[PDB]
Design a protein around this nucleic acid. Structure first.
Ligand SMILES: [Mg+2]
Length: 528
DNA sequence: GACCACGGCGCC
DNA sequence: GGCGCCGTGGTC
């Protein structure tokens, strides 16, 4: 309540306001600090930002990123958001956290500062006795905050000219497809409108409408529905190609070039730390965790991500991290042997259940896929699909046992846990409507494996980052079970070696963790 | 110019 | 299973 002049005492909680949500692009409108119960408001923010030793408060990372932008080394420290997020992943927003635990998220810097000091005490207390959740805060989450700050502030270098050339070329190909579609349509119309396209296909042309949209109940025109109509008419062939190009052009090719920062000449994403229910990171503004890789055009877009002059990119990907984690949690002897002997999984899992059929189940068992789905995709009847599943479990029994065990606990305790003890509360496991319940169950037993893979990758980044500094290298991107680094080409070899070891042995399980590494000048070449 | 819901799709 | 962003359509 008391107002002392700037600056504040040591260890004060920071509050701040931005002109916009992206710290790399925002203008610092005001900052303040709180300690004990009194507030310190800065006359001139950018100047005053140098008096601080660490950014400590709600959204600590954001301010830290902006400080880095200004050439200031202001590391992020404590953040009540991370405490609330560990107590319950559904706590994803300051406004929400405040409205739940107390206080009010306003747009006045001083008010935000006081809010941080109070909410921190509150939540830090609520974390009394919860040692495993406390271990995650000290040893993983809080330290990762500072790593992510350097990733966002470093950005990635982009080949802008390359994407300009590619935009025109792709624009050229879209023109040919739009044309031949209008020809078979008998008239022109908006192809980007699924409402217009529904009419031409299912009414004008005499095509069968197989499925409906969720909320409104219209005849769907999704790629699945379309693929099924591939034989009925040559028009859908071209529409499927049209969608492919438009998607890749509207989302990646056109926008990314226009998001280069002038001060850096690089592209800057945001890594959100309290955004998912399983403990995963998410990415936005822009999302660099969903850059295309599959199709030919998609691969060309990924070549536009390049290293600095005199530097190389280093790409490290875990192999079947989620399946290897399931082996550890399930304790299933057989599945462990497959990994322990270091053999190709999707062939050994076939041999020990009697190729294609082997993969789809391993992929889908984590998601608890429908017996009808395996029948639909693998192009096999319902009974053969339904039998294969029972056959998979007869081979890996402790897996099925682990699923049933997991759900029983979730019904009793109200939550499920990862190996390190990250909680997700899943309510409707005792729902009396089967579809609601069985949906909640799928959410339930998946969380520990996705969440445990997320814990290991997070922990590796924490351990790796100090080592990269000793060698003058950088952490650039993260894609759930992948990392992209940047080293000087003189030392990139050694960095790839060390990074691999750090990731693999981050937390020895019942099986080994394997990492595939590659070095290239662009994101694409650094894998092939 | 802002925001919103929906269908649709990119990635792990 | 877990995300975020696109254009369309509609509203203020
Ligand atoms: Mg949606």
């Amino acid at each position: 309540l008391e107002e002392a002049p700037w600056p504040p005492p040591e260890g004060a909680f920071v509050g701040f306001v931005l002109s916009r949500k992206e710290p790399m692009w925002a203008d610092l409108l005001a900052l303040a600090a709180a300690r004990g119960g009194r507030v310190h408001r800065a006359p001139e923010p950018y100047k005053a930002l140098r008096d601080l030793k660490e950014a400590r408060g709600l959204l600590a990372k954001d301010l830290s990123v902006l400080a880095l932008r200004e050439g200031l080394g202001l590391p992020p420290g404590d953040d009540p958001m991370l405490l609330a997020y560990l107590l319950d992943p559904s706590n994803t927003t300051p406004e929400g956290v405040a409205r739940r635990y107390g206080g009010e998220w306003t747009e006045e810097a001083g008010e935000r500062a006081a809010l941080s000091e109070r909410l921190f005490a509150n939540l830090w207390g609520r974390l009394e006795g919860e040692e495993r959740l406390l271990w995650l805060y000290r040893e993983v989450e809080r330290p990762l905050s500072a790593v992510l700050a350097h990733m966002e502030a470093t950005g990635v270098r982009l080949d802008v000219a390359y994407l300009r050339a590619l935009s025109l070329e792709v624009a050229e190909e879209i023109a040919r497809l739009e044309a031949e579609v209008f020809r078979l349509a008998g008239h022109p119309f908006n192809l980007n409108s699924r409402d217009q396209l529904e009419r031409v296909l299912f009414d004008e042309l005499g095509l069968p409408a197989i499925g409906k949209t969720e909320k409104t109940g219209k005849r769907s025109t999704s790629a699945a529905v379309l693929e099924a109509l591939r034989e009925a008419h040559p028009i859908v062939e071209k529409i499927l190609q049209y969608r492919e190009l438009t998607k890749l052009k509207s989302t990646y090719i056109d926008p990314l070039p226009d998001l280069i920062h002038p001060r850096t000449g690089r592209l800057h994403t945001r890594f959100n730390q309290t955004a998912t229910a399983t403990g995963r990171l998410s990415s936005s503004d822009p999302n660099l965790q969903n850059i295309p890789v599959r199709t030919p055009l998609g691969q060309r877009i990924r070549r536009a991500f390049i290293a600095e002059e005199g530097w190389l990119l280093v790409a490290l990907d875990y192999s079947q991290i989620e399946l290897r984690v399931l082996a550890h949690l399930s304790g299933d002897e057989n599945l462990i042997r497959v990994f322990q002997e270091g053999r190709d999984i999707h062939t050994e899992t076939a041999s020990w259940m009697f190729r294609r059929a082997a993969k789809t189940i391993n992929f889908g068992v984590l998601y608890g896929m429908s017996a009808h789905r395996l029948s639909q995709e693998l192009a096999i009847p319902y009974e053969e699909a339904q039998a294969f599943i029972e056959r998979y479990f007869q081979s890996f029994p402790k897996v099925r046992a682990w699923i049933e065990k997991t759900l029983e606990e979730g019904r009793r305790r109200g939550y499920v846990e990862t190996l390190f003890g990250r909680r997700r509360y899943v309510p409707d496991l005792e729902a009396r409507v089967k579809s609601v319940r069985e949906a909640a169950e799928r959410m339930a037993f998946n969380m520990p494996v996705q969440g445990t893979a997320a814990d290991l990758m997070k922990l590796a980044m924490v351990k790796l980052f100090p080592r990269l500094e000793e060698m003058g290298a950088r952490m650039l991107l993260q894609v759930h079970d992948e990392l992209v680094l940047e080293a000087p080409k003189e030392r990139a070899e050694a960095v790839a070696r060390l990074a691999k070891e750090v990731m693999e042995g981050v937390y020895p399980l019942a099986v080994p963790l394997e990492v595939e590494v590659g070095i290239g000048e662009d994101w694409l070449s650094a894998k092939e």
